[PDB]
Amino acid sequence: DLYSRYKKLQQELEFLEVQEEYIKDEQKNLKK
Amino acid sequence: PPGGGEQEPPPPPAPQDVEMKEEAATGGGSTGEADGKTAAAAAEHSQRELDTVTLEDIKEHVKQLEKAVSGKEPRFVLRALRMLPSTSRRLNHYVLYKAVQGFFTSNNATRDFLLPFLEEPMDTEADLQFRPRTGKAASTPLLPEVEAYLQLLVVIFMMNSKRYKEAQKISDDLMQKISTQNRRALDLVAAKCYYYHARVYEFLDKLDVVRSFLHARLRTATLRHDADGQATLLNLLLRNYLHYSLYDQAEKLVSKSVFPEQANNNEWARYLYYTGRIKAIQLEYSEARRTMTNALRKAPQHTAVGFKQTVHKLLIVVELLLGEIPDRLQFRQPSLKRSLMPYFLLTQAVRTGNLAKFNQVLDQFGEKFQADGTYTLIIRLRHNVIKTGVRMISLSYSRISLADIAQKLQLDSPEDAEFIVAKAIRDGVIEASINHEKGYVQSKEMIDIYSTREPQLAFHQRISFCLDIHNMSVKAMRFP
Amino acid sequence: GSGLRQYYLSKIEELQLIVNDKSQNLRRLQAQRNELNAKVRL
Amino acid sequence: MYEQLKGEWNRKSPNLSKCGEELGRLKLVLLELNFLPTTGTKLTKQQLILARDILEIGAQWSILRKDIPSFERYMAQLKCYYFDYKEQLPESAYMHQLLGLNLLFLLSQNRVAEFHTELERLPAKDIQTNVYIKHPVSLEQYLMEGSYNKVFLAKGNIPAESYTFFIDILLDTIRDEIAGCIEKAYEKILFTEATRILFFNTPKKMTDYAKKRGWVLGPNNYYSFASQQQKPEDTTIPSTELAKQVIEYARQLEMIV
Amino acid sequence: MSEKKQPVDEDNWDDDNVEDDFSNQLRAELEKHGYKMET
Amino acid sequence: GIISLLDEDEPQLKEFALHKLNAVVNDFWAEISESVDKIEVLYEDEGFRSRQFAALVASKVFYHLGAFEESLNYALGAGDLFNVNDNSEYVETIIAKCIDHYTKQCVENADLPEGEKKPIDQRLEGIVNKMFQRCLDDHKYKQAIGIALETRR
Structure with missing residues (x-):
């Protein structure tokens, strides 16, 4: 688990960030 | 007996109710935000942390005999909290021991029993993951005890309780710390315990053990956790380094740890004063008088906290020595009326030419001056005596003569005229040019602050400031 | 533990803290986006 | 153990082998039990007492041989012993003037920040007593307003020695600044004002101001120059970077925060 | 906070004026004309 | 002062210099910040008989x-005096940085296994495989496999 903890948090980083950019996209499009 | 007897049904129950429930809600919501609230870095029980800052200092000092607060400790420390049944049992005990305080006699805990009360948190499947809960449970042993202001034979027991709490630092640094962010709460606890433990080492000798331990507890900062522990421990580091007469200050300047960031308008404000006197001890030259004004104007919201009188006193002392000559009657607080009289006479003889009156006042009130920790004021105040006069006339006359400006400032000799015409140029106390073909110190003036890019210089930082404010709003809005 | 475990136990520290914060931020952005969706829908 | 205790102490220092041999005594002085912490055994602090005084005469050898870095070296371990980590008893009668030669050491060499972090360790020992500091401290008070040559009207007062090594550095420390002040915008006080009032009864000091500085004294005076630029203000140099600042302004203001 | 290390508990520029910077405000100064009936 | 303790160039004060270094080796690295050349040049001595200690x-x-x-680099240049010193709670910082630099360096070398490969230091890896021995001893092996993956070995 502990090594898979450290891998799974990594996987929880970028897949979480793509949503961060994603809401930017959605908001800017919604303005239009 | 008939007088003093009828006057203790009401006194006990007040702390019995509100002193009961306050930290009950504190530990309650704080515990729920320790289990939950992974972003518990800013707890609303941190405002309850502040409410505990001013809470016990005025609420309760003694354990409130007649069975008001004495039974709190045996109740509140008996917290096993195994699981929901064995924790709803303690939920029952919150009210169950209340019959013990009211009807029966509480468990007397005159700062001798709290140490053996540190077994109740261990009894019946002890909880160690709640090092915040047991941490405030480590503050509470001091809370009646230290806040009683004894410093009498229980200073050492203070020290032992804080050794158990430093063992709670050991528990954070060693025991089940899975990014729980509790040091930044344990840094506030380390703050509180080391204010009155600071006093503890004021009622005793030096603190060098807390110097090395302070370099260690500070050492762990900046590596894993850094928030207000480096700030507060740095200030405690500075206060008695300054309090002791030694080199002590260029070590502080070389102490390149000056940027523990925003301290919520409380730590940072005084922080500018701790660093401010430091920059003052090396003949401050208008670089830190601005940060003295800054610190005095940052967090004045209290009412004469006690060191605020010292910042208000020492602030314009350096400015008088530098360029300015305002008095210090502007904030004539009742808190200031008795702390103004020596300094009141202090600043008059500077601008006035009666240096004999200045020595009269200095010999008159030097005892208060020596109590203020400003010994070196006279060694450099005669500096700004003639520099204050020459600044005055230098401001008055535009094309003034140096062969005339001396004779008015009780110079009395042409040779004495130009002993002040040797460093005023390099210093910048007046903008003029001295000549021997014409020994006339004629000044000049310029414009184009509006015609040179002064305003856009002054504007950029504050533009960033306002956009900072916008960023703070957008970041601190959408909680619901 | 100290030599072998502590390097990963102490390195999942910030891997957990970052996802700890960006969920708060993420839900902030979610609330705003849903505001826009309701408005332009109506 | 006590090698050459007073071999050449009062008479003179004819042989420098006693120098390195005394420093061989400091080999054991620093290494008997400790030198900094000095944890226990106060009796080991006694040869740190004499270890201090031997460093004092050692700095008296450095003052004789113009030995600045070794001089401060002696004063360090000295002052290291006076901030000995243990509260021991009285050191000697030789501390207060020793710190007098330290304070004259550091005062004349433009060490003001170092200066004012030195007079704050013995609060009332260097104000109304310890003339070996009182002359340096009133000295610095002379170095406060304009009393730099007034010091030289006050040179004839020394408690023990000539103080030549810092009445001379107090010469130079006023020499760079009289040279700078004359280099300032000024109209040439003649040879008699720059050469007779100050110091230097017509030595090659005229080579000092004539060579180290300008003011070429040929026709009966020193001679200035412009000492100024031509006011080269472009003001369109920031025409690029400031546009960058605005681009950042609308940048962050336009960004979805 | 929680220090209370104090003693027991404009007049700066306007009194800095009116007492010392001001001269004819606390005391009189108008006698010069008696020193001016000959100049 | 007190600082000009080290103003001698004697040989036995080179071995007493180290005896003062490990004595003052704990806290006043703020002072040693201005005392870097006093440690660097002290490290630069062929006639220094306790080399790598500076x-x-x-x-x-x-x-x-x-x-x-930098502390990692000179910790490499500390010789046996550093490799022997691996049981502490402070050293876990510099060794954590060591395994960071190590694993990133090994991912780099695994990138291009031929041509202009950044050479890994012998003393750089000497505490690396030693730490892997800690992986062998401290009763846990998801760590030992973990660094095995990242190490590209």
């Missing part, structure tokens, strides 16, 4: 200085 105390100070890599 890199011991150097790796002490440069951490405080803020050079997370």
